[PDB]
Amino acid sequence: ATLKEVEMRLKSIKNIEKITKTMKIVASTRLSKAEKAKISAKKMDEAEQLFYKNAETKNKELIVAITSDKGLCGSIHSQLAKAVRRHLNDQPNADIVTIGDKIKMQLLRTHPNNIKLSINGIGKDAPTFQESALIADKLLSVMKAGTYPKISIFYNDPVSSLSFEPSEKPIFNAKTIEQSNVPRDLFEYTLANQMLTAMAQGYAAEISARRNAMDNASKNAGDMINRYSILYNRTRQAVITNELVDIITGASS
Template sequence: MLARSAITQSARCATSQIRGYATLKEVELRLKSIKNIEKITKTMKIVASTRLSKAQKAKAAAKMIDQADATFYDVAKTAEVAEAKESPKHLSIAITSDKGLCGSIHSQLAKAVKRNLEANPTTDIVAIGDKIKMQLLRSHPENIKLAFNGIGKDAPTFYESSLITAKILEELKAQDYSKITIFFNDPVSSLSFEPSTKPIYNPETIQTSPGYNVFEIDPEGKLPTDLFEYSLTSQILSAMAQGYAAEISARRNAMDNASKNAGDMINRYSILYNRTRQAVITNELVDIITGASSLD
């Protein structure tokens, strides 16, 4: 009877020991996976930090483009004509990129575009970047008329934006739209961003501006059309450059937060691992002592 009781108790201890080893193994695997994730997030943070200086240069160049365009349109008083006209035909150009792991930067811009669609349901959309395209396809697939990908791999160039403009002019006849708005992410600081917009004026609006004659331009020339195409190209470049800077900064911050969270989880799982290991060792000692006592 005593031997049977000892065998039963030994079996229970063995079962407990097996469970302890399984739990310890699970904790160990989880801890290892979190450490691997921490290495990845730290590496991505370093990569984003090294690319940030290049993004800041692109952002500074974009600001100069904005100032040049704004000066011309302010002198020509183009905005007054655009506000006075009715705008039944709208075009929105939404700019993000193809990459993720950068917080809510893409979803915030998608929300801004969707709010505009609520006010103007018939607005046509050009999606530049797979992230904005995929989010808008879920809710407004019929509004997307043109999409581009391969965006955000590096700092944007004028050649890249000129190819996008040429396709928009060829496929959608952008000059026929009475109102064109570019949606992009504006890097307010190194820690924050906000969805912003840029207006683009069509050739007719430019030519009928009250201050247009100040520049002594031949009224029969093609300059309004050429200026519209150049302005569209430069403003797309500017929006892409500012969005690129905002995305790199957001990715660095997101990877920094992810690394900190992974570090906190590693500390918690390390404590859990040590406690579980101590429990397994204690069970083994109890098993050995119980077995030795039963033999006596």
């Protein structure tokens, strides 16, 4: 612990504090955009859950997991990973589709074989019906969505400004819509709508979680800055005293 070592470390941590505070404010600004997109998708989802409240539809299996590709979220990815893992362990026959590189990674390492398809890069901006519709088309054509008796999707629900809940939502198959070709296309449409709503909610939750994570990081950086400021003062005084002792010893002979 030389004076230069402490100085370098202190300045580095001060830089980190600035970076984390800036990210916290930027996420706070982005959060309102995410929230209004969330509301817009929420009402469109309510419009169909109103119908299902009357139709009362009810259910191998297919599971879609939705997250972004990038970290610093504070367990946004791992909680949903745990939810999907503990769901899958009861029925490992189910195939799964991973949206988001993080959830892809955290499922691949523990349940490698049943990952049918991975969708990447779509968690950056607020989700669009374009992305949801194209993903639904790929899921139907390539992943053969229509062949499964059960389909459900997993996401992070923005419960509160400080917390989120891993939640599952069922996409009832055309066979389940037909009784409890209009039912087929209604399946496709509700598939796209539910996936869009899940992406929007997960995006809002992720932005809020990243905001809170950077807030915690800024608190911790400030505490470290206090500690190393104290250490710097101690080392400064020690250096002055030791060099002065050397000078005095040289003088006193």
